């Protein structure tokens, strides 16, 4: 299950066909946390550091929080 | 509770070679990535490399690429650095440092992140005829 | 791809001190403290995060391509070298600032 996370924070970020991809997690799916992803995420990405300090700035504002976050990277 | 213990410091010879040795105890060695830093007395501080876990990465710095190479055994909580070419900008103190986080198959890097959250009292190397 | 640091910097006690770190593109900073005689310590990492045992003082922050260690309520034992440290990811090096001798004045 830790794998799935993973893949959802690794996907979550290349996006920013796909459609289809909120979906099927949405499906699927029925602080120290993101600390322990931190370098499987990021590995080897270009830029991965600033990536992934957009992502927890978003994590921050919104007081299962990371789909809120795709429903607001599917806004635009 | 968590200890680093450098050795194999000393005199080397220019254009010469020497082998620091670091003996870790207080925490799981095979858990975190490892890495050397030195500094010339009264200046400021220079990283060097950095070893994975499973040994599978390695970073240096270009100041001492091809020229040391890091290397560690988990059997002994240890950590090595070979350092072949030495030059007088070599003589320093040399520091063996934890890692900060985890590191999970061979993902780990030095990153601001987590920094780097234990250091050694270090060792002195020397290079001169 | 530089980490650039005030080599030096004076506050009186009791006085707010703000090291400025800045560079070039976005990285994450850690801050070590280095006192006379004596291995660095990590002191903030994550841009604003500070390990266990560390005084509430110390507090840190990142943007605009400048990070800030502040110290509020500078004290003597404040005096220190303090690098600033962040990572380049299209050579793979980690980055260190020069250092700030900061002091402490009276």
């Known amino acids: 299950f830790d794998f799935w996370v993973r893949k959802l924070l690794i996907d979550t970020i290349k996006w920013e066909c796909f459609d289809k991809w909120v979906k099927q997690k949405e499906d699927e799916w029925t602080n120290d946390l993101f600390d322990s992803f931190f370098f499987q995420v990021i590995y080897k990405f270009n830029e991965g550091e600033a990536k992934w300090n957009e992502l927890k700035e978003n994590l921050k504002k919104q007081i299962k929080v990371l789909f809120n976050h795709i429903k607001e990277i599917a806004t635009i | 509770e968590v200890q680093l213990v450098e050795s194999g410091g000393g005199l080397a010879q220019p254009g010469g070679s020497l082998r620091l040795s670091c003996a870790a105890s207080?925490?799981?060695?095979?858990?975190?990535?490892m890495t050397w830093v030195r500094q010339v007395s009264g200046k400021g501080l220079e990283w060097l490399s950095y070893?994975?876990?499973?040994?599978?990465?390695?970073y240096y710095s270009d100041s001492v690429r091809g020229r040391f190479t890091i290397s560690r055994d988990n059997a002994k909580n240890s950590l090595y650095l070979q350092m072949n070419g030495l030059t007088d900008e070599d003589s320093a103190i040399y520091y063996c440092?934890?890692?900060?986080?985890?590191?999970?198959?061979?993902?780990?890097?030095?990153?601001?992140?987590?920094?780097?959250?234990?250091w050694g009292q270090g060792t002195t190397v020397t290079v001169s005829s | 791809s530089e980490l650039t640091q005030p080599p030096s910097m004076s506050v009186s006690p009791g006085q707010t001190a703000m090291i400025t770190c800045s560079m070039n593109?976005?990285?994450?900073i850690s801050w070590y403290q280095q006192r006379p005689g004596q291995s660095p310590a990590l002191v903030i990492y994550?841009?604003?995060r500070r390990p266990s045992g560390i005084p509430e003082r110390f507090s840190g922050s990142n943007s605009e391509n400048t990070a800030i260690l502040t110290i509020t309520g500078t004290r003597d034992l404040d005096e220190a070298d303090y690098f600033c440290?962040?990572?380049?990811?299209?050579?793979?090096?980690?980055?260190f600032g020069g250092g700030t001798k900061l002091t402490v004045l009276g």
């Open positions: 440092v934890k890692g900060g986080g985890n590191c999970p198959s061979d993902t780990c890097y030095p990153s601001g992140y987590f920094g780097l959250d234990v």
């Open positions: 207080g925490f799981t060695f095979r858990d975190h990535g």
């Open positions: 070893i994975t876990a499973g040994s599978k990465m390695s």
């Open positions: 593109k976005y990285s994450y």
């Open positions: 994550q841009d604003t």
């Open positions: 440290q962040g990572w380049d990811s299209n050579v793979k090096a980690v980055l």
